[PDB]
Design a protein around this ligand. Structure first.
Ligand SMILES: Nc1nc2c(ncn2[C@@H]2O[C@H](COP(=O)(O)OP(=O)(O)O)[C@@H](O)[C@H]2O)c(=O)[nH]1
Ligand SMILES: [Mg+2]
Length: 179
């Protein structure tokens, strides 16, 4: 089985850990974990090929900036995340996440992921953004950002409803297999 390493990055609270947990051995409902702290591996079949994808979670807050790069050695694919309910999290994609990953992971493919897709049409989310004259991120903005940062692709998903989650990991695996 082909061995590849995936690292997930992006602002705090944008859904990284929940996205990884979707595919797990077992679930642990009520515990909150900043990062998956056990060895999580996704078994993905791509064009008749068996891939083992080691999943490395990270803490995105600035206090973790100096130690986060310990997760980057020998990465084969990056999931670079923002949340569709958070315009700020998208703004940090070109400002913070892209130069950081390109420095520590040169030439490693990036999948840009818009998380929390279920919140685009959520009334509470729309009201909370609207009070500050904001709105959920539109798909066209994610596509534009993928072009701006040189991502291999842009995908949307919801760890809550599961929509799009399988496609994220399959595309990440296909990207990891190119090199
Ligand atoms: N509605 C919705 N909430 C989500 C989704 N993914 C994560 N969350 C919530 O967002 C919060 C932060 O998620 P987490 O995975 O810990 O984010 P991280 O800080 O990027 O690892 C938690 O309260 C989750 O329950 C999603 O797809 N949809
Ligand atoms: Mg987390």
């Amino acid at each position: 089985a082909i061995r590849k390493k995936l690292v997930i990055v992006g602002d705090g609270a944008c859904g990284k850990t929940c996205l990884l947990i979707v595919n797990s051995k077992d679930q642990f409902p009520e515990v909150y974990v900043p990062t998956v702290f056990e060895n999580y591996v996704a078994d993905i079949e791509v064009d008749g090929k068996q891939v083992e994808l080691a999943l490395w979670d990270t803490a995105g807050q600035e206090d973790y900036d100096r130690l986060r790069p310990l997760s980057y050695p020998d990465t084969d694919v990056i999931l670079m995340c923002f949340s569709i309910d958070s315009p700020d999290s998208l703004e940090n994609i070109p400002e913070k996440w892209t130069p950081e990953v390109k420095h520590f992971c040169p030439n490693v493919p990036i999948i840009l992921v818009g998380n929390k897709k279920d919140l685009r049409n959520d009334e509470h989310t729309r009201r909370e953004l609207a009070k500050m004259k904001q709105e959920p991120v539109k798909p066209e903005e994610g596509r534009d950002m993928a072009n701006r940062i040189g991502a291999f692709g842009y995908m949307e998903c919801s760890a809550k409803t599961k929509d799009g989650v399988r496609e994220v990991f399959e595309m990440a695996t296909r990207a990891a297999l190119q090199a």
